[PDB]
Scaffold this active site. Structure first.
Site, PDB file in Angstrom:
ATOM      1  N   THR A  22      -1.417 -15.080  -5.301  1.00 49.47           N
ATOM      2  CA  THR A  22      -0.504 -13.950  -5.458  1.00 49.47           C
ATOM      3  C   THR A  22      -0.885 -12.629  -5.108  1.00 49.47           C
ATOM      4  O   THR A  22      -0.781 -11.862  -5.875  1.00 49.47           O
ATOM      5  CB  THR A  22      -0.142 -13.892  -6.996  1.00 49.47           C
ATOM      6  OG1 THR A  22      -0.882 -13.137  -7.768  1.00 49.47           O
ATOM      7  CG2 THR A  22      -0.316 -15.407  -7.668  1.00 49.47           C
ATOM      8  N   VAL A  34      -5.996 -12.350 -10.247  1.00 48.62           N
ATOM      9  CA  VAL A  34      -5.957 -12.147 -11.749  1.00 48.62           C
ATOM     10  C   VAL A  34      -7.301 -12.144 -12.359  1.00 48.62           C
ATOM     11  O   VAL A  34      -7.925 -13.017 -12.084  1.00 48.62           O
ATOM     12  CB  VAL A  34      -4.786 -13.064 -12.126  1.00 48.62           C
ATOM     13  CG1 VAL A  34      -4.738 -12.757 -13.744  1.00 48.62           C
ATOM     14  CG2 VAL A  34      -3.528 -12.934 -11.435  1.00 48.62           C
ATOM     15  N   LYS A  54      -3.719  -7.276 -11.955  1.00 49.46           N
ATOM     16  CA  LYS A  54      -3.469  -7.598 -10.392  1.00 49.46           C
ATOM     17  C   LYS A  54      -4.269  -6.632  -9.569  1.00 49.46           C
ATOM     18  O   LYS A  54      -4.038  -5.395  -9.575  1.00 49.46           O
ATOM     19  CB  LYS A  54      -2.039  -8.000 -10.070  1.00 49.46           C
ATOM     20  N   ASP A 111      11.378 -15.335  -5.605  1.00 53.02           N
ATOM     21  CA  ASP A 111      10.353 -16.054  -5.335  1.00 53.02           C
ATOM     22  C   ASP A 111      10.067 -16.928  -6.509  1.00 53.02           C
ATOM     23  O   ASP A 111       8.939 -17.218  -7.244  1.00 53.02           O
ATOM     24  CB  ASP A 111       9.002 -15.441  -5.045  1.00 53.02           C
ATOM     25  CG  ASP A 111       8.028 -16.290  -4.062  1.00 53.02           C
ATOM     26  OD1 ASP A 111       8.363 -17.463  -3.678  1.00 53.02           O
ATOM     27  OD2 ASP A 111       6.902 -15.588  -4.010  1.00 53.02           O
TER      28      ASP A 111
END
Ligand code: B49
Ligand code: B49
EC number: 2.7.11.1
Lengths: 277, 270
Positions: free
Chosen positions: B19, B23, B38, B115
């Protein structure tokens, strides 16, 4: 498909390792002692043209093919083993290649492209991950899964977006394209090797396509200007030409200063395989 | 209102997680709260994630440039079903109900997720279902004659998003299709055509006589669930129902849906 051997490949091959993910194993011809690579794909009998393209190839720069086995709903493709794996497997540990290193790789890939194009065939997935290095520092081409056979212009929307030529990205609107797309993919790949990422790699891939169909799209350049030579910046300028009408062939590029200059040999890649220690 | 400080001055980096920017498990210095950060029109995700107060949307704590967000202990549904296997029709049904509430609030806010997939549905240790990664989310505003961008994850895209022709465009109803695909994903561990090259998938979705996918084995799944797939994967956007409309379908308004179902699944993990 017709020259498939209906045989358990494990009969004549010791499988030695898992390397893939279709999955790919390091194996050894029991009697011959010769190493190979077997790509296995699970097949429900209910895109296997890669076989058709490889069986008809006969070039040092193109990964060698040895036959295809089909057993128990499993399809095995036997091909030439390359000790050091892909240039991506390498540079991730090593860091960005030298300009001579990069120069050598391009000459070798262009050698594989020139042949492939004269065979009326396009790879369409030229990238660091599809270029393999053998323990002797040599270069081979692999992953012809999305590669096309001609017999005059392709219409398919396919590739890895960051490495895709803009005429491929716009194929739905601009109509068919041809084999000069591998030359774009090569230019991007040169930068991949130089900067460890292709241009715009942090941008959403679909966006990178859209962006590259825009009027006034600027082809990528190398970041560090002074770090690289005049000959390299030019090689990038000309390989990454938008109009496929104006972009040079593999033959014409093999006579470019960057890849025609002396000193280039399998030695520089061995010098690279040393940094893996 | 983005801060010029260092994320570590309030928090911690205790473990690592999947992503774009990665993370990282974290602990608030003053109170003892767990957060995930993030690490990376630059300010697009934060503006959508701010202005979001809903139970089904992951919480937003601040940004600096690390976007700070609620921590989810059981990772994504994708992480979970790689351990557990096919979710049961009930657990799927809960998740769907939970995701639709998320989408319905989002749409009423003129937001589109774009998404929706198993990987972007996060389960916290409380069994709460949250939606994350608004990295390519839309915010309809005052822009005149807008056409929404060519973006997504092909396997989960609605056919109208796959079109690049001059004639076309899409709206929030793309999410309802993505959700349909996500249900099959939660059920068969792979969205339809996962073995196809993703750009070829986009091409097929636009060809004449495209057929929406359906659940591969019929007997295993009820007619409510089979129907749920049928309508969420409606080829034509005009005929495709809205988030609000879906919330009253036979499947997600059936009796037996409580977090309890998620908690059982979180024991397949243990
Ligand atoms: C160097 C980094 N890692 C350290 C162990 C290794 C990672 N990479 C490796 O092990 C590796 C090796 C040793 N061979 C391959 C792949 C192929 C090969 O050899 N012939 C082929 C022919 C066709 C094809 F489609 C793939 C291959 C890999 C990925
Ligand atoms: C391999 C499967 N394992 C689960 C059983 C994985 C273990 N756990 C994990 O990977 C994991 C955990 C514990 N959190 C996340 C990610 C996020 C999170 O928590 N809040 C977010 C908010 C926004 C966002 F964009 C991502 C996250 C992962 C991938």
């Amino acid at each position: 498909d017709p020259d498939i051997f209906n045989r358990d490949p494990r009969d004549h091959y010791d499988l030695l390792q898992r390397l893939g993910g279709g999955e790919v194993f390091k194996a050894r011809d029991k009697v011959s002692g010769d190493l190979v690579a077997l790509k296995m794909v699970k097949m429900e009998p209910d895109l296997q043209k890669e076989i058709l393209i490889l069986k008809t190839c006969r070039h040092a720069n193109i990964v060698a093919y040895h036959g295809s086995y089909l057993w128990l709903q499993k399809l095995w493709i036997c091909m030439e083993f390359c000790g050091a794996g892909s240039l991506q497997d390498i540079y991730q540990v090593t860091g960005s290649l030298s300009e001579l290193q990069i120069s050598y790789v391009c000459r070798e890939v262009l050698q594989g492209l020139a042949y492939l194009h004269s065979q009326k065939k396009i790879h369409r997935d030229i990238k660091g991950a599809n270029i393999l290095i053998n323990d002797a520092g040599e270069v081979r081409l692999a992953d012809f899964g999305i590669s096309a056979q001609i017999g005059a212009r392709r219409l398919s929307f396919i590739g890895t977006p960051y490495w895709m030529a803009p005429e491929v990205a716009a194929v739905a609107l601009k109509g068919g394209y041809n084999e000069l797309c591998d030359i774009w993919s090569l230019g991007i790949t040169a930068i991949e090797l130089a900067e460890l990422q292709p241009p715009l790699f942090d941008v959403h891939p679909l966006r990178v396509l859209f962006l590259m169909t825009k009027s006034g799209y600027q082809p990528p350049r190398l970041k560090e200007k002074g770090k690289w030579s005049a000959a390299f910046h030019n090689f990038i300028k000309v390989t990454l030409t938008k109009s496929p009408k104006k972009r040079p062939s593999a033959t014409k590029m093999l006579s470019h200063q960057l890849v025609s200059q002396p000193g280039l040999n399998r030695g520089l890649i061995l010098d690279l395989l040393d940094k893996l220690k």
